[PDB]
């Protein structure tokens, strides 16, 4: 469960992010010993990207390079191999997607929503690593940027976000065999840029922005009861946070609290319904991509 491949543990990788400008950092945190490693920079700076892992490879998807010399939304898919410590371009998406949400089903990467200039996407596309090919699938019922995405029981959920006019509490679910999206129970809070993940049988939505404050509240959707319930709030309000699951606990990384770009990383224990601080990143940032895979070489 803890060991992967050769004889190694798994790390929490954070890629990219934003502080003053879009960042190229790739760093990996080890919950077993508290250590941080700096790894190979992304080829192109990006905030607002998502991260995921397939076959042990780390993928960086979408985003936007906010640089003083120009701002460029990204359709880019790039893959990091922990065994070589090298980034490799993959095929690009049909469209640039900043503030994207990503989920993995059946070894396939789903890219959801996001923005391209003043365009807010409802479009969705699926990537097949064995063929290095993107194909559009059915669009969402809602245009969503800053959308959180999670996978539960081989179904993909798109949660919260912003359609261009209002921040959203709505959420919806993709059924792959019917290529069909259906709305589900909305959250009890409007959230854009929330951290969205799955733990046991629930989809969590932590933090985000409700249109006037960054949030510390956290809720989770029990798919069996189709209801949202608040759990314990985080210790920091945060928006544009990184999130992932590691050994049964939820990790939230950085974000913006309305005053500071956070370096705080918090870990949620579901058994005790408590959050603790477990480390800080090397520097404060928002809009990172986060995933978990094997230790690098």
Give 10's strand partners.
294
SS3 10: strand
The residue behind tokens 């606990």 is 249
Contact of 219 with 187, CB cutoff 8 Å? yes
What burial letters (b/e) apply to 81-107, b meaning 16+ CB within 10 Å?
bbeeeebeebeebebbbbbbbbbbbee
By CB under 6 A, how many residues form the interface with ligand NF3?
A: 11
Looking at the Cβ atoms of 137 and 262, the one nearer to ligand NF3 is 262
Q: Going residue by residue from 8 to 47, which x/- string records binding to ligand NF3, judged by CB under 6 A? A: ----------------------------------------
Ramachandran assignment for 240, one of left (phi > 0), alpha (psi -120 to 50 degrees), beta (any other): left
In the numeric block, which tokens belong to residue 84?
A: 């070589």
Looking at the Cβ atoms of 52 and 173, the one nearer to ligand NF3 is 52
In the numeric block, which tokens belong to residue 224?
A: 């069996």
Scan residues 226-265 and list those touching ligand NF3 (CB under 6 A). 239-240, 256
The answer to whether residue 59 forms part of the interface with ligand NF3 (CB under 6 A) is: no
DSSP secondary structure letter of residue 33: T
Looking at the Cβ atoms of 123 and 148, the one nearer to ligand NF3 is 148
CB of 237 to ligand NF3, least distance (A): 9
Using the contact rule CB under 6 A, the part of the chain among 54-62, 64-72, 173-181, 272-280 near ligand NF3 is 54-62
Task: Identify which of 87, 92, 88, 62 has the alpha carbon closest to the alpha carbon of residue 74.
Answer: 62
Q: Which of 47, 214, 217, 264 binds ligand NF3 (CB under 6 A)?
A: 214
- With 0-12 / 13-18 / 19 or more C-beta atoms within 10 angstroms meaning exposed / middle / buried, residue 135 is exposed
Looking at the Cβ atoms of 57 and 184, the one nearer to ligand NF3 is 57
The answer to whether residue 98 forms part of the interface with ligand NF3 (CB under 6 A) is: no
The answer to whether residue 53 forms part of the interface with ligand NF3 (CB under 6 A) is: yes
Q: Which of 2, 38, 56, 166 binds ligand NF3 (CB under 6 A)?
A: 56
DSSP secondary structure letter of residue 24: -
Q: Which of 26, 49, 54, 100 binds ligand NF3 (CB under 6 A)?
A: 54
Q: Going residue by residue from 133 to 172, which x/- string records binding to ligand NF3, judged by CB under 6 A? A: ----------------------------------------
The span from the CA of 77 to the CA of 94, in Å, is 11
CB of 162 to ligand NF3, least distance (A): 9
CB of 259 to ligand NF3, least distance (A): 10
Task: Identify which of 102, 176, 171 has the alpha carbon closest to the alpha carbon of residue 141.
Answer: 171
Which residues sit at the interface with ligand NF3, rule CB under 6 A? 53-56, 107, 193, 209, 214, 239-240, 256
């Amino acid at each position: 469960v803890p060991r992967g491949s050769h004889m190694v543990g798994r790390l929490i990788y954070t890629a990219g992010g934003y502080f003053r400008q879009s960042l190229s950092y790739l760093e990996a945190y080890n919950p077993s010993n508290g250590s941080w490693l700096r790894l190979a920079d992304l080829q192109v700076p990006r905030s607002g990207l998502a991260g995921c892992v397939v076959g042990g490879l780390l993928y960086a998807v979408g985003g936007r390079n906010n640089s003083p010399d120009g701002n460029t939304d990204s359709s880019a898919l790039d893959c990091y191999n922990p065994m070589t410590n090298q980034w490799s371009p993959c095929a690009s998406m049909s469209v640039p997607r900043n503030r994207i949400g990503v989920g993995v089903i059946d070894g396939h990467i789903y890219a959801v929503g996001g923005s391209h200039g003043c365009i807010h996407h409802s479009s969705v596309e699926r990537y097949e690593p064995e063929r290095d090919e993107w194909h559009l699938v059915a669009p969402m019922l809602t245009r969503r940027i800053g959308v959180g995405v999670a996978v539960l029981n081989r179904l993909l959920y798109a949660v919260g976000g912003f359609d261009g006019t209002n921040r959203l509490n709505s959420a919806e679910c993709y059924y792959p065999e019917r290529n069909e999206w259906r709305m589900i129970t909305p959250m009890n809070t409007i959230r854009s840029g929330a951290g969205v993940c799955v733990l046991h049988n629930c989809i969590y939505a932590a933090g985000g922005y409700d249109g006037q404050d960054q949030l510390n509240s956290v809720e989770r959707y029990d798919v069996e009861t189709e209801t949202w319930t608040f759990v314990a709030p985080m210790r920091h309000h945060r928006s544009a946070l990184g999130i992932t699951v590691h050994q049964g606990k939820i990790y939230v990384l950085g974000g913006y609290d309305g005053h500071t770009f956070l370096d705080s990383v918090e870990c949620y224990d579901p058994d005790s319904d408590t959050w603790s601080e477990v480390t800080r990143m090397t520097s404060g940032r928002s809009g990172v991509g986060v995933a978990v895979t094997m230790e690098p070489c």
